[PDB]
Amino acid sequence: GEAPNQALLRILKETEFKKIKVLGSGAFGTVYKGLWIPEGEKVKIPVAIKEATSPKANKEILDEAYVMASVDNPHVCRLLGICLTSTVQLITQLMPFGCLLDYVREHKDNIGSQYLLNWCVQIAKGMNYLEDRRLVHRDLAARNVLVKTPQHVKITDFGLAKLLGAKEYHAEGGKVPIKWMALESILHRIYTHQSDVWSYGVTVWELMTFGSKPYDGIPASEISSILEKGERLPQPPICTIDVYMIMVKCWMIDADSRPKFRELIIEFSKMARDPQRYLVIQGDERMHLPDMDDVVDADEYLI
Numbered sequence: 001g002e003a004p005n006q007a008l009l010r011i012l013k014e015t016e017f018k019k020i021k022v023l024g025s026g027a028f029g030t031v032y033k034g035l036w037i038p039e040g041e042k043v044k045i046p047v048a049i050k051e052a053t054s055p056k057a058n059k060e061i062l063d064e065a066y067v068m069a070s071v072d073n074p075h076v077c078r079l080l081g082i083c084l085t086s087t088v089q090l091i092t093q094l095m096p097f098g099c100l101l102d103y104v105r106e107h108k109d110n111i112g113s114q115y116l117l118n119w120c121v122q123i124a125k126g127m128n129y130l131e132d133r134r135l136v137h138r139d140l141a142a143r144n145v146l147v148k149t150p151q152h153v154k155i156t157d158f159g160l161a162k163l164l165g166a167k168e169y170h171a172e173g174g175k176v177p178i179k180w181m182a183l184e185s186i187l188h189r190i191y192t193h194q195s196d197v198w199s200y201g202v203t204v205w206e207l208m209t210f211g212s213k214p215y216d217g218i219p220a221s222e223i224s225s226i227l228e229k230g231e232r233l234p235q236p237p238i239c240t241i242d243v244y245m246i247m248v249k250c251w252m253i254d255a256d257s258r259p260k261f262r263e264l265i266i267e268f269s270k271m272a273r274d275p276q277r278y279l280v281i282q283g284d285e286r287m288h289l290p291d292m293d294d295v296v297d298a299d300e301y302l303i
């Protein structure tokens with residue numbers, strides 16, 4: 001048949017971890033900064049805790065818990081465990097610099113070509129891992145890429161992520177982010193690893209423009225026709241034709257014509273070896289970005 005998913009779901013006691021502050025309090029739920037102190041392990045792990053009780057919200061949170069427990073890659077957000085309180089809490093690694101979208105907006109004047117191209121390689125690596133795992137993300141964007149360190153980023157938000165068996169995912173209704181979606185996804189609700197490639201193109205565009213909103217002011221209903229006419233996002237000023245051509249290729253009508261994530265890794269790696277030949281940023285190179293006794297990072301806390 002199909003391969004058994006032998007992932008281990010860890011249940012954590014509310015007493016094993018201590019909340020410190022609130023990082024974000026969105027309409028969907030709250031995200032807290034905290035510390036996880038397992039059993040008598042003499043370690044302190046900096047965590048993110050994502051929590052009225054409704055049976056439907058628990059069903060969705062447990063679905064995201066399933067997906068996250070089933071992924072293990074340096075460029076994919078790792079689930080540490082769940083805490084079965086009144087409302088189910090997801091415990092994950094603290095990404096202390098927040099989302100990449102806000103990070104690029106906040107640090108425009110200090111982000112160099114090396115960092116941008118490295119982020120691109122890193123996102124493609126994480127994305128190619130999900131492809132190996134037959135996982136279609138369906139919500140890749142700069143807001144869904146977390147920053148561990150300025151030199152290390154990870155893909156997050158598996159709220160829409162779908163697992164395949166033997167080529168495409170046919171969706172139902174639900175609120176979807178139109179401006180990051182492939183044409184087939186808009187017109188037919190079809191999602192594939194190649195639809196994630198389109199979203200990857202937009203994510204790269206977001207970074208190269210230092211956090212600009214795609215199609216600013218254009219309503220989501222117009223988008224479908226804008227794409228059908230053969231219009232795409234403009235060339236960011238810092239982008240050479242070399243980089244912009246990669247973006248344009250991710251935005252082909254024919255999904256099989258778009259690049260594969262494994263090709264995006266290669267393409268961006270070659271560029272990352274000589275960043276100034278591919279991105280033109282004024283004042284580049286001179287630019288630079290950044291009880292604790294038993295504190296250990298989750299990436300170093302294996303079991």
Ligand SMILES: COc1ccccc1Nc1cc[nH]c(=O)c1C(=O)Nc1ccc(N2CCN(C)CC2)cc1
Pocket residue numbers: 023024031048077092093094095096097098099143144146156157
């Ligand atoms: C809100 O971001 C998310 C989007 C989708 C899914 C999950 C998250 N939140 C997660 C999930 C896992 N780990 C994390 O650290 C986070 C997170 O948001 N962390 C997070 C968020 C914000 C910060 N600050 C960065 C500096 N800034 C000036 C103030 C806020 C730090 C960490």
